[PDB]
Amino acid sequence: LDCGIPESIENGKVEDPESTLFGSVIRYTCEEPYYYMEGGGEYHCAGNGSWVNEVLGPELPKCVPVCGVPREPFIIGGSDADIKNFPWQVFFDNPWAGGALINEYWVLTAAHVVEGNREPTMYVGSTSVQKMLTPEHVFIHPGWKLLAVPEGRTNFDNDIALVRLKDPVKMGPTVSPICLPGTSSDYNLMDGDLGLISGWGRTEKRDRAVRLKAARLPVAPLRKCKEVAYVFTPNMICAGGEKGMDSCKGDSGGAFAVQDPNDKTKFYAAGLVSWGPQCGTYGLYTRVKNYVDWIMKTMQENS
Ligand SMILES: *[C@@H]1O[C@H](CO[C@@H]2O[C@@H](C)[C@@H](O)[C@@H](O)[C@@H]2O)[C@@H](O[C@@H]2O[C@H](CO)[C@@H](O)[C@H](O)[C@H]2NC(C)=O)[C@H](O)[C@H]1NC(C)=O
Numbered sequence: 679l680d681c682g683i684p685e686s687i688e689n690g691k692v693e694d695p696e697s698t699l700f701g702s703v704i705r706y707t708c709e710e711p712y713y714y715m716e717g718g719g720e721y722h723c724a725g726n727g728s729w730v731n732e733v734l735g736p737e738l739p740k741c742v743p744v745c746g747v748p749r750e751p752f753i754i755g756g757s758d759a760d761i762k763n764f765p766w767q768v769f770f771d772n773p774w775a776g777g778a779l780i781n782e783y784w785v786l787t788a789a790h791v792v793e794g795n796r797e798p799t800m801y802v803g804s805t806s807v808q809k810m811l812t813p814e815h816v817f818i819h820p821g822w823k824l825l826a827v828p829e830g831r832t833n834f835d836n837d838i839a840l841v842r843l844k845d846p847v848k849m850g851p852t853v854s855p856i857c858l859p860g861t862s863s864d865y866n867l868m869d870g871d872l873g874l875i876s877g878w879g880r881t882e883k884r885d886r887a888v889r890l891k892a893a894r895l896p897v898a899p900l901r902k903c904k905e906v907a908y909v910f911t912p913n914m915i916c917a918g919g920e921k922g923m924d925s926c927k928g929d930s931g932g933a934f935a936v937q938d939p940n941d942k943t944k945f946y947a948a949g950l951v952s953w954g955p956q957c958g959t960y961g962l963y964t965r966v967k968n969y970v971d972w973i974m975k976t977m978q979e980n981s
């Protein structure tokens with residue numbers, strides 16, 4: 679007749695129970711607004727002594743991260759940004775680069791960032807580069823050309839990699855994932871579509887930025903990037919061309935964040951900073967939509 683004090687769950691809590699006896703009810707709530715429940719979270723104390731929920735039975739709820747919604751709305755020619763504006767931003771200190779958290783155990787980045795560093799040290803939650811995440815394994819896309827001499831690379835096709843983390847990342851005001859693009863035609867970018875870039879790369883005034891910078895740039899026809907040999911493919915998005923705003927050395931791997939077409943309050947990773955012919959002109963970004971199948975397969979098979 680006593681179900682006992684209910685067990686807590688990670689990233690959520692159980693409201694203080696009024697009673698733990700037969701017929702009492704308790705409710706689990708996730709830690710909002712950073713997490714949501716994977717129910718309604720209500721359990722009653724059943725006659726067999728278990729706390730039971732209509733959908734989960736005696737199993738406890740799972741709180742999963744909310745993706746793509748910064749706590750505070752918001753690189754050459756950019757401006758100071760707070761990590762709260764781009765909570766999905768990840769910093770790699772060797773080589774100096776970025777990435778995007780896509781869930782509690784995975785970070786998306788450019789293959790060129792991790793090709794020579796299969797155990798990358800990564801940092802999240804701070805506006806300045808001056809929490810450390812530990813990698814479990816780095817998965818480089820199989821279409822990435824590995825080179826004996828990476829400097830001088832001219833073929834950045836398929837510049838994408840995933841980093842699986844050893845421990846789950848705790849979400850909060852400064853750390854949260856960005857959404858992925860869907861596979862429908864609603865995720866086909868068009869000329870002029872606006873996206874945000876963020877990073878600690880070179881600026882017009884310093885070789886690298888100590889504090890996060892960001893800029894809003896429009897997508898442009900691939901021809902623009904070509905008119906600034908290097909390989910250009912449909913797996914690349916061209917963006918920039920306005921007010922000298924562009925991503926630069928040290929920003930590689932960061933997400934080109936675009937407002938989700940179905941939900942204006944969230945951002946998704948439409949591109950990843952890859953390379954560019956000349957800082958301050960047009961830049962090339964890996965087109966994330968083209969890799970969604972591989973990203974999902976990799977995460978599912980390595981869970
Ligand atoms: C006790 O029972 C639940 C199922 O709850 C009973 O049935 C329910 C509709 C509501 O009438 C409750 O008040 C009843 O007590 C067990 O639930 C099952 O748990 C197994 C695995 O353990 C799970 O495979 C089945 O899906 C669950 N069933 C459904 C209805 O939720 C529960 O295991 C029991 N606890 C104990 C100790 O035997």
Ligand SMILES: O=S(=O)(O)CCNC(CO)(CO)CO
Binds near residue numbers: 836969971972
């Ligand atoms: O399996 S996925 O990589 O998600 C789809 C194929 N992507 C390519 C990349 O060159 C086409 O855009 C083919 O590997």
